[PDB]
Design a protein around this ligand. Sequence first.
Ligand SMILES: CSC[C@@H](NC(=O)[C@H](CCS)NC(=O)CCC[C@H](N)C(=O)O)C(=O)O
Ligand SMILES: [Fe+3]
Length: 329
Amino acid sequence: SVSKANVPKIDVSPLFGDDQAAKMRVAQQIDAASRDTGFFYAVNHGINVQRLSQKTKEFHMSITPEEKWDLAIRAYNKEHQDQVRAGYYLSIPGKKAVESFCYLNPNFTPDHPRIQAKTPTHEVNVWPDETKHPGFQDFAEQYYWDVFGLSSALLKGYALALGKEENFFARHFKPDDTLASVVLIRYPYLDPYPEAAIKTAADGTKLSFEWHEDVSLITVLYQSNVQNLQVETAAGYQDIEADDTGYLINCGSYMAHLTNNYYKAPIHRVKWVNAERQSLPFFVNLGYDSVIDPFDPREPNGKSDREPLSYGDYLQNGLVSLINKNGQT
Ligand SMILES: CSC[C@@H](NC(=O)[C@H](CCS)NC(=O)CCC[C@H](N)C(=O)O)C(=O)O
Ligand SMILES: [Fe+3]
C-alpha cells in the first residue's frame, strides 16, 4: 500500500494584506511545495466552502434529465454547437458515472468583443431556469468572483516565489478577459457501480480519471472529505489527504512552460471511490492574448530555450489534447 504525499497547509492570508515580509515567507512555502510534490493546501483563504458545497449539492441533486439536455455541451447535444466548454456534461448510466456543470467568466456576455468576434474558448454561460433553481446563478457568479480573488492572491505568492514583482502573473488575470472556468463535478455513489465506469491503472489501481497534467496556470480546488487523489513522485504514486476546509493548489502546464519546468505541473490521477462527493476546481487561465516570456529561475541570466506561447493558443490546444488522452468528461 501507498505512502502519504507531503502536502503542506500554507496560511495564505498575508497575500491579501500589505505586510511584505510576511508575504515573502508565504512565497517561500509556495516555492518549497512547488519544488517537492507540487501540491499544497491553502488555508485561511476566506471563502465559505461549506456554503459552496451546500449550494452545489442542492443544484446537483435537483437538476432533472430534461434540464441536463437543455444545458448540454455539444458533445452530448448536437443542437448546441456554440457550447464547447460551458454547460452540462451528462453521465451515461451503466458507462460513465461522473457528471458536471462548467461555467466561464460571467463578463462574457453577448456584447463582449471576444464573444462578438467568436474567438475560440470564449462562450456565454448557460444557466438553468431561475424558478427551478432559485438563487443558483447569482450564487455561482458570486463564487466565481470569490475564487478569482483567492486566485489573484495566490498568483501574487507564486510571483514572489519565482523572484518576480507580485503582479507578474496577476496583471494578466483580469475580470474583463480571464478564460478561467469553474467546474461543479458530481461523483456519485452507485450500487452496483458499473465496471465500465472504472478504469484500471498499469499498477492495478482502480481509477475514475487517468494520469494527467492540468491545463491551467494554477488550479484551485475544493473537494469533499473523501480521499481520492494521487500524485506521481520519484517514490511512485502517493495519496493526497483530503481536507474539505482548505483549497488544494497545484500548477498546470502553462506554469511549467513559463518556468522551464522549475515548477512542474505534477502528474496526478483520481482513484475510484464509491462515494457521493464533489470535486469543484477553478482553473486559473489568463486572457486570450496574454503572453508571458518564458524564463528559468535556476539559470544565472534567467534565460530559457522555450518559445513564447499565448495563453489562448495554449488553452485551445490543451483542452483538445486532454479530451483525446483521457476521454470526454
Ligand atoms: C484531480 S483532476 C480534477 C477533476 N477533473 C477535472 O476538472 C477535469 C480533468 C482536468 S483536471 N477537467 C478537465 O480537464 C475537463 C475540461 C477542462 C474545463 N472543462 C475547461 O474547459 O476549462 C476531477 O476529476 O476531480
Ligand atoms: Fe487535474
